[PDB]
Structures are given as C-alpha cells and as structure tokens.
Amino acid sequence: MVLSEGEWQLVLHVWAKVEADVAGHGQDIFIRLFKSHPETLEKFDRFKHLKTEAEMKASEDLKKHGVTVLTALGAILKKKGHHEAELKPLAQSHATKHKIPIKYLEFISEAIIHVLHSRHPGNFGADAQGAMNKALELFRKDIAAKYKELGYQG
Numbered sequence: 001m002v003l004s005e006g007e008w009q010l011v012l013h014v015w016a017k018v019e020a021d022v023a024g025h026g027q028d029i030f031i032r033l034f035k036s037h038p039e040t041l042e043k044f045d046r047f048k049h050l051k052t053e054a055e056m057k058a059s060e061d062l063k064k065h066g067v068t069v070l071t072a073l074g075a076i077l078k079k080k081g082h083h084e085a086e087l088k089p090l091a092q093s094h095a096t097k098h099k100i101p102i103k104y105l106e107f108i109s110e111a112i113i114h115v116l117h118s119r120h121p122g123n124f125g126a127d128a129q130g131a132m133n134k135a136l137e138l139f140r141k142d143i144a145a146k147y148k149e150l151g152y153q154g
C-alpha cells in the first residue's frame, strides 16, 4: 500500500504536536495499552510487576522507555514509506528477542490512535485519523513481512 503526500502531511502534522511532549505521550500510550490489554504487560520483564496506573505513572524507567519507543516510531513515520533500513533491527529484536505477535502491534496502534484522538481532536479529525491508521497499517504490514523472512510467524 502507498499513502499520498496529502496523507503523509496529515500524519506528520499531528506528530509534530506529539513531539512537543514525547515523554507525556509515551506514558499515556503505554498506560492505555497495559490497561486495555493486560496480557501485553507480561511481555516486559522490567515492568510486569506494576500493579496500578499510579505505579505506572510514577515509573521513571517506563517513561524513559516510552520516549525510546516513540522516537523510533517517529523516525519511521518521517521516512514516509522509505523505512526499510529502520525496520530491519526493529523487526529482528521484536521477533527474535521479545517475541511480539502482530496482534500486539495492532493493540499498541489502537492505543496510539486513542491517545491522539483524546489529546489532539482539532488535528485528529476523521481524515487525519484515517491517514494515521493507514500509516500504522503500512508499518504493521512491512513488519509482518520481515517477521516471515526472519522465521517468526507470530
């Protein structure tokens, strides 16, 4: 699949807002993910002990992790589709070291959309959300293709 320049512009416009506070967006996204799909928390040995949202918000390590994840996702989005190089190491670590099913990538994509919708309604209308969903589906499609090449079905 391919996004038009117009769709990329909608994606990058709202992402520019996210970049005004990466750490804050990272926390909301992971808390949303862990609360909506608790099973995903079991994949993080470093955070699986967190019991409440209060504990999650207070975790310095979780906040730092969120910045690392969003920064990588941002680098990929800014390539506007030409992200083959950025995807390689990401796909290998998540398929071989962390063992993350495509299903879980769908869950975090939902968390991202939810948080952007909550925080940036003025820059995340129907068209912009459609553009973001398309960019995330492209991301998941390409990561899935790499998973297969690497020998991981998940």
Ligand code: HEM
Binding pocket: 040, 041, 043, 044, 045, 046, 065, 068, 069, 072, 073, 089, 090, 093, 094, 098, 100, 104, 105, 108
């Ligand atoms: C938006 C998609 C995602 C991106 C861009 C992303 C990015 C990253 C990055 C950059 C790291 C650190 C470097 C590395 O280990 O490769 C990381 C670590 C990790 N990711 Fe992801 N990730 C994504 C989705 C997920 C999902 C959905 C899970 C599973 C619920 C997951 C589980 C992990 C784990 C377990 C680690 C190691 C954390 C640690 O022990 O420090 N990731 N991810």
